[PDB]
Swiss-Prot record, chain A:
Stretch of the intact protein here: 90 to 110 of 110
Disulfide bonding pattern of the chain: 6-11
Source organism of the structure: Homo sapiens
Gene: INS
Protein name in UniProt: Insulin A chain
Length: 21, 30
């Protein structure tokens, strides 16, 4: 989930937008 | 901004700014 992609590893816009409604 | 390790409130705030009026969901335990 988001912690693995954005906190434990380097976040990206592509990934962040996966969590927008 | 986005291209870094973002945790906790820092991650929530990035979601807020990027997602804007779409809103977002924050699910840390998946």
């Amino acid at each position: 989930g988001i912690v693995e992609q954005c906190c434990t590893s380097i976040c990206s816009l592509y990934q962040l937008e996966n969590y927008c409604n | 901004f986005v291209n870094q390790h973002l945790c906790g409130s820092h991650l929530v705030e990035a979601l807020y700014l990027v997602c804007g009026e779409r809103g977002f969901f924050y699910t840390p335990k998946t």
